[PDB]
Amino acid sequence: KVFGRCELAAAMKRHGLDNYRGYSLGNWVCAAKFESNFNTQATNRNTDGSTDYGILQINSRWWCNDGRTPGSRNLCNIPCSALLSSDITASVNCAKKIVSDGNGMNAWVAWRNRCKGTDVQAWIRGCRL
Numbered sequence: 489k490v491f492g493r494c495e496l497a498a499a500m501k502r503h504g505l506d507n508y509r510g511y512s513l514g515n516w517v518c519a520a521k522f523e524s525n526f527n528t529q530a531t532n533r534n535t536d537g538s539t540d541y542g543i544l545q546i547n548s549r550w551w552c553n554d555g556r557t558p559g560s561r562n563l564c565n566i567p568c569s570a571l572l573s574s575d576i577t578a579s580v581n582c583a584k585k586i587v588s589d590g591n592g593m594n595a596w597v598a599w600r601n602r603c604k605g606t607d608v609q610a611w612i613r614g615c616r617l
């Protein structure tokens with residue numbers, strides 16, 4: 489599924505991601521924009537052989553099982569395919585773990601490089617929330 493901007497903001501808020509660990513909703517929408525362009529089915533293969541999955545491009549090195557990332561963990565206790573669903577529950581619940589791991593949203597390099605320090609409220613501007 490390719491979410492609309494405000495549609496995704498609303499779904500993230502319903503799943504409790506707004507201000508989670510102090511990160512306002514616009515931070516999460518901005519991250520999803522640059523990770524996946526709001527496409528739940530996005531996948532991308534990393535140089536180390538791991539793969540990133542879903543709207544927040546969650547990595548199989550640590551967070552989900554795909555059966556093809558040697559030496560990896562599955563700390564969200566999910567198949568990586570669950571991160572591609574039109575229902576964002578699994579991605580949100582796993583993102584909550586990731587953002588709590590110590591480095592906050594810097595875990596998403598694209599958030600650090602493209603969202604951090606910017607006017608992230610623009611990503612939710614105009615949305616009925």
Ligand SMILES: [Cl-]
Nearest residue numbers: 489490527529
């Ligand atoms: Cl689509």
Ligand SMILES: [Cl-]
Nearest residue numbers: 492493521526
């Ligand atoms: Cl957009």
Ligand SMILES: [Cl-]
Nearest residue numbers: 512513514609
């Ligand atoms: Cl915001």
Ligand SMILES: [Cl-]
Nearest residue numbers: 555556557558
């Ligand atoms: Cl594996």
Ligand SMILES: [Cl-]
Nearest residue numbers: 560561562563
């Ligand atoms: Cl594990």
Ligand SMILES: [Cl-]
Nearest residue numbers: 553566567568
């Ligand atoms: Cl699995």
Ligand SMILES: [Cl-]
Nearest residue numbers: 499574575576
């Ligand atoms: Cl949803």
Ligand SMILES: [Cl-]
Nearest residue numbers: 597598601602
């Ligand atoms: Cl980047």
Ligand code: NA
Nearest residue numbers: 548552560561
């Ligand atoms: Na894994």
